[PDB]
Swiss-Prot record:
The keyword Lipid metabolism does not apply. GO terms for biological process: cytoplasmic translation. Disulfide bonds: none annotated. It comes from Encephalitozoon cuniculi (strain GB-M1). This is Large ribosomal subunit protein uL2. Keywords: Cytoplasm, Ribonucleoprotein, Ribosomal protein, RNA-binding, rRNA-binding. GO terms for cellular component: cytosolic large ribosomal subunit.
Amino acid sequence: GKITRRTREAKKKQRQPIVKVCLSYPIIPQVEEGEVIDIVHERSRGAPVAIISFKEDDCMVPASEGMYTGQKILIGDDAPIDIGNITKIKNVPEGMAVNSVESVYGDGGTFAMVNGSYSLVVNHRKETNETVIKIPSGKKLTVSSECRCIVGVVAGGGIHDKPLLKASVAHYKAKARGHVFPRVRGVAMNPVEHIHGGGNHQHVGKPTTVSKKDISQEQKIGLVGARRTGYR
RNA sequence: GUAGUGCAGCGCGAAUGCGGUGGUGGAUGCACCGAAGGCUAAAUAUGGCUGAUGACCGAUAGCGGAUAAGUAGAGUGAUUGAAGUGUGAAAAGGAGGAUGAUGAGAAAUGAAAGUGAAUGGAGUGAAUGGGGGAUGUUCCCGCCCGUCUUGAAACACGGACCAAGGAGACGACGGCAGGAUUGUUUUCCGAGAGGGGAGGAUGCUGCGGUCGGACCCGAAAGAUGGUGAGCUAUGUGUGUGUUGAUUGAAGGGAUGCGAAAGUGUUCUGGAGGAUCUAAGCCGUUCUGACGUGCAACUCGAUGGCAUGACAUGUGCAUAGGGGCGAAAGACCAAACGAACCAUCUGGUAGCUGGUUCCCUCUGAAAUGUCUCUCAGGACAGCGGCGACGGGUGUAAGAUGUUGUAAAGCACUAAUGCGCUGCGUUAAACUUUGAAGAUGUCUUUUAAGUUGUUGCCAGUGGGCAUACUGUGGUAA
RNA sequence: AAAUGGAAGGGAUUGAAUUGCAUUCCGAUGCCUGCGGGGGAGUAUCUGAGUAAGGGGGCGGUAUCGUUCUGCUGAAGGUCCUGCGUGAGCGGGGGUGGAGGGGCGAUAUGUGCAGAUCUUGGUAGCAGUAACAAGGAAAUGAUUUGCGCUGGACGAGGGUUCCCUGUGGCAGGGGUGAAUCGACUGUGGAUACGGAGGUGCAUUGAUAGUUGUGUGUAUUGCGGCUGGGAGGCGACUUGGCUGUGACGGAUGGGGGCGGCCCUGUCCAGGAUAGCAGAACUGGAUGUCUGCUGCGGAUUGUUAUGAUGCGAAGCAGCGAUGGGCGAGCCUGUUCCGAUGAAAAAGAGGCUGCUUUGUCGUACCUAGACCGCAUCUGGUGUCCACUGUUUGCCGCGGAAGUGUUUUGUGCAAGGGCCGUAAGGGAAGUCGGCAAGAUUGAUGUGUAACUUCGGGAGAAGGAUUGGCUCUAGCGUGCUAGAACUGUUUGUUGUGGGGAAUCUGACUGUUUACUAAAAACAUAGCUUUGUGUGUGGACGCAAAGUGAAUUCUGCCCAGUGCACUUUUAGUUACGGCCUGUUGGGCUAAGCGAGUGUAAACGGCGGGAGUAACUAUGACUCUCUUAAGGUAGCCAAAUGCCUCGUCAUGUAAUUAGUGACGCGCAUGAAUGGAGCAACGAGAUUCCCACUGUCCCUACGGCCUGUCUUGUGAACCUACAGCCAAGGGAACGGGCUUGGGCUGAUCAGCGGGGAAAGAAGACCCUGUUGAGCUUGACUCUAGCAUGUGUGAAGUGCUGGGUGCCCAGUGCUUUGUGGAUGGAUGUGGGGAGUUUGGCUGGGGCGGCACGACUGCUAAAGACUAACGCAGACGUCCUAAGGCGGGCUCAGCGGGGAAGGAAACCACGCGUGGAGCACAAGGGCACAAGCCUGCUUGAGACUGUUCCUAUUGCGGGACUGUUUGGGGGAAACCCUGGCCUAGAGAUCCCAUGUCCUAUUGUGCGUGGGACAUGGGUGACAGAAAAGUUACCACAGGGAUAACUGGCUUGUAGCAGCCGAGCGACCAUAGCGACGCUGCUUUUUGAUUCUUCGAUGUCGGCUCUUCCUAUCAUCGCGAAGCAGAGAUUGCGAAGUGUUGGAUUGUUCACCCACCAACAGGGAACGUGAGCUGGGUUUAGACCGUCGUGAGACAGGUUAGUUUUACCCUACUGUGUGGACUGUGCAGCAGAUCUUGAUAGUACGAGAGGAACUCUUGAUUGCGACCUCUGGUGGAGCGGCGUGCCUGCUGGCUGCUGCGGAGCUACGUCGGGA
């Protein structure tokens, strides 16, 4: 055989990468006052980015829905509750939506940083200083009560409300983001390139669930380690 | 190196009257030696350079290269790579022709294939050859060689013509034959334990055997080390190109209807992978032209697309079991279901083709056994060349063996009648039974006049016919 | 009774082809006899063919040593003539040549050529041929005139090709000048992006943003002088700093560099027969985007608007002749796309001074690449005018390129034009051509995703001239007049249905553009972190919307769990004499999952005529195909059945459904819109055809110049025969024509290419997996690594598990073990065989027959059997008689048991068949383990192993029997396994000495190779390769004739009677070569493989026409037979078809052969390698004589054949060869003969035609680049007159659709 498409698309990307800018906020224990100086678009992202200026430091963060240029926000551990306002996660009531939550007290942000997402604060277990939160995927996770966050949802709304509708729109999206476009189906190739192969009719020819444990790398194509298949 | 012969990774890790070794793992005597630091001439190997030699080659030979040869030339590149010697002793001199001069000589020699001029003979028959005769012919005979084949003049293959070159030689080890010199030659049997007297050696020439490029020329492939994205494919940086029309979305104005909710008409505006046309780009049909071309993909007419998921110059990134692909196994410098260059490499070939002087003496086989054996091989059979050595491929007299042809019903198996006879059968039936074959004795029957052994080749696709079977409607 | 004209060998022959004879004769390289030569032989002689193969004796090339000679008074080599030798070869003479050359003996070898699609060099025929060139002219040609269209600059590439002089292309000498052009400088990149600096005029033979010059701008350095504030309410003015570089597509409005057009005036130019209100040409002149103060509510656009967060207006600041637009100014809009980076800031007025290095000539295609002076390819910029929406098409300028003594046109080609009447009858198929076409009124359906369909369809108008109306001044609307009726001198064919893909897009550079690929939408899976943080990132399937997406978890796969089986490795620990316990993942098990891979049944009865089966029983599955759809691109049978379209329907559409083998994201149903996709029909239109004609230009034909190639054993007329079974040459017959030129495609099984199909080889490679043997990676225990401490749990004080803490090692790794692993590597996948494959085993082995009276003897010949079985079914002693028949005996029968008289085996003996056997080899019965331990000779059986039998000997040996005697398995012929390795027994043994809980050997048995003298082994190729094979298939020929076709003989019956008018059973005998088989002789270094179209010839077994018989022949119409091959034998619908089947006509619509006639004659529908779809089959790569769609047709100029032509008068004779007309019809005969009637003929006379053949142009039709006319576009200034385009008529000539012409 020859080497399959999955493995070559991985090698092309170490030669010529897609790069995003790494948003994060700094450490400031005393309550300061910031200044949104600009909100801007970025290639390969869907969310707009805000430029906020402190007394001796500037930062780039995901803008929340409800920000505007020239607005003042506060940073510090004991800061008041309002859209924006980087503050510590024990000063936040239950049922409130936050974004860009860190996990180690000083790493910037880790959770909920894409277009239109947030995490939920569910419980404050005041003994042991633990906070249960819900992250965007649904998993529940206890963090310390000293990690910081941002109040509100990320801007950029529901981007899937509008269909792509046309070939050229999927062409411009994959140029900016790096998806495989177009995709030739594996059953339409010759056997030399794909485990799905030739044959006098187009058909896979054997089970499409494959293992995730113990088999050769380059055999893991299809539905890898699937617990269940079917419509519902 | 046979149960480490030597070396290495990982882990464990010594001794001080002590340590190591002794062709089978371990023990114990006796023998013999001192590792884990260092240096050391000579006798041995070998491209090239310089001297000296030769039963070596003599211009298609010998090094690729006897000369302005690793040159001229070819390839993007790594790489690749020829052909060509001669006036004379002396320039004493020529170089369109003619007339001349110099010289020993117009000047190295100068074959065949093929041609021009003159002159002799013949012809309207393909030509050419042999016998017999004659300054061409008249009569007789005569199809084109080489090769594979049961079988070729073949509608089987190679061969237009001429010259030169062109294929069983050499090394090692063994045997035999012929020949040369010398001769006071021999470590035996047996797994072992045990037992125990019986003419060659060293050269020379030839032939048969094996391994060597191995009689000469020939694959599809495999591996080691290198070159390419100037063609073409995808990504990315920076530039450039695109005429004139058609249709008429949202938004906005005015005007009519109606109790209201609402709705009619018409202007303005200029959307959309919306419709043509141009600069231009492709490649549907004519199955048009052309088809030793204008051309290793072109030309004419017709048709399709022309704001894009476009077209195009240039910087950078991706390389061969790898890349790149809106996917055709497509494309990667005129060959891609694995590129190109050099080496290993004179790669192997049970298969096809070729294999060079005369006369003379003998002269086959196309069958049996074993074979991943069936287009091959070995052993045996048939043949050649020997050498040494003395004494029946036909009949007659006697005496044995046989179960076919024909015939028959005694056994086995069949087959009609008449109520003891008449009728019909046989490769796997036989009570009988030939012609023909086949054993032994006697040359103390006729007629005639071989034994022992050495070294070796080719052959193992057959076919026809008289008589005689088997299968088949038959050939 | 057979297909080119032909064979007792020919002419012929009445016996010169019949039969019987011998008293004559002819006839070999054989025989006898005399000489000559070779080889044997024991020396008075005898004996000679020969492939593969072997032996003896000779001839020749080049050298050495070792001897012996010759050449300038002319060597070798070469050429002609001549002697000797059976031959290989060796001598002499005359020319030429100008320096060396030999004999004899031994010895060393790169030692002798006709061939190898041999190597290198030279040369023929073809052939003065193919191909290419000959560009418009004027005696001259710096002058006059005719035609074509690229023309001018920068880069890549080239490198002196550029200028002058001399010369017939060379030779000699010249020419490239930079602050203000590019680069040397920026950025991870650069001659196009960023960036200190300019414009005119003149100048050389050749350079110029570079030389010279008028004016400007920047810069290097060096000076001199001078200022840190004035104004304005404000916007802002001034020597008075911290700004820029720096950024996408589409589209409206305003305004324009240059160019072009219209117009007033002035100065000039060129042509003119005549006329022209005074033409034609050139030149020169002819304001508000914004901001501030006052003001205090309205105001504007082509469009969206602006405004108490301050409108209009007034006053300022700042910026900057008429008409058709490039940069520029100012708006709106589009994106899950939002449109680089770095170098480079300071500044007033003046004077002197500086400015480095390298490139610069010439060429856009005849100066580049494609081997070239090649119709191909090659980045950027500029370029006038009439007509027009158009920078297109159809015509003109500017600039640029170009010659001046070949012919005038046969046939056949390449590219075009016009055609009576018909109108797709042509063809696989409307292929090709014709037809529609611009603009403006009118009028527009089904359906539909409401947007579309739509330029639907269908109808009408159009020039020129002279005016009117509107306002925006060039467009729009209206009217009169006029012509030989006509005006776009350009620009879509349309309509009704079915299959299929949603749509715009992409693809096999060089045979496939598609239904294939992509696509939005829909669904499933994994993943909490990569610079990226789940509206993310990655992997698969299906393919817009609408409506739907059923049932199956038994098999395979995937997931989770093993906190309630089993199985399992290194190391460690435990216990013990070298064993056993404890400590993984995985496998196994349990549960879940089909938008995972996939699957989705038989049989019996049953409703008041039949028929069917709602209903029932029954077998059975993991579950038994649901909703829908169909002879559909999916249905074998099959051209299914019914309806509809036609004169006629293997086509199309509608309907039906037990569907070989339909069916649900393997996606099912479904067609709005779109398509150079596949199909069928309608209108229109036509040279597609009936059936061809005439014309144009370039070729060809003829001349001069330049001048190839392929191919070539030798050659080139036929019939038959035989032959390797289709001859140019051989045997027996028949023949044109003495040497030319143009044509042409029958033959040379023509050329090209070591057959790609098929088989064989112990030859490959691409790809697959449930082949064999392995392997990267990954999983999971475990060894190494860093010190100190606490904690909970196991067993017996113990070892270990997790385990938190402390800081003072570190996280980078590294050794071995078990599991997994077509992701990857290497390799294999027998043979025989009436081709191979599938099947069978004739592959080891036993019996009978085939087998021809000793033994041996073949076939995928015939009929069977073998891989076992038995403690007796082995050994021995004794006693008995078997199958069956006859006469008897209570219940007793066809068969029970007793018993007498006979019984040659007619029964038994493990199993196949054959042989054998009676006080036995059979049956019953007693005792036993000879089915013992060793050892030698021989047969099948040989050149030979294993195996299976026979016969002896030796035993401090058995069993049976009184004993003689027998016994080493089975009554005899089948039941069978090497080398190497391992297991057990007996006898020996390890070389420095001795042992051994460690090994080695000899001999004998067992463990097994059935392909049985004995490898360790799965598939596929239509993507394919190489060595061969006519030892072997798929087409033609040849032999054969079962089958196929056509005929005879007999006489049982039939025929109202009557075997034969006509028929003819049951049986029997032939012929042909048109069917399909059987075979494998020719061809695999190639003989182009189906049908049609076109064209010629032959056969007869006669369909019609001519002649003539029979009758169950009255006439009419037919039926059956003989002579006879001269002439005829058609037009259409459906299918690729051959074939078939229907319609119409006809005198009739017969059957066959010629390499299944005919592809350098065509066509290419069938078949048809490489793309693709469906059904069934396979885990898969793939398969199917199952269906469907898309898919290169090369070369004659040679010889012969054939057609003409040439090969030297006039008038004729006579031999040979060719050979043509055929068929139908009107009237009369005649309503007659014949007949009860109904019906209904003939000879002779007569009228017209159809088709073939040969001519002709008076008439009619076609053509007519001859000629005359009409209407246009551009150009000559307009009129006149020309040239160019479209159109009507159209003589001569040619032609058919027109006219003429057949023996007594």
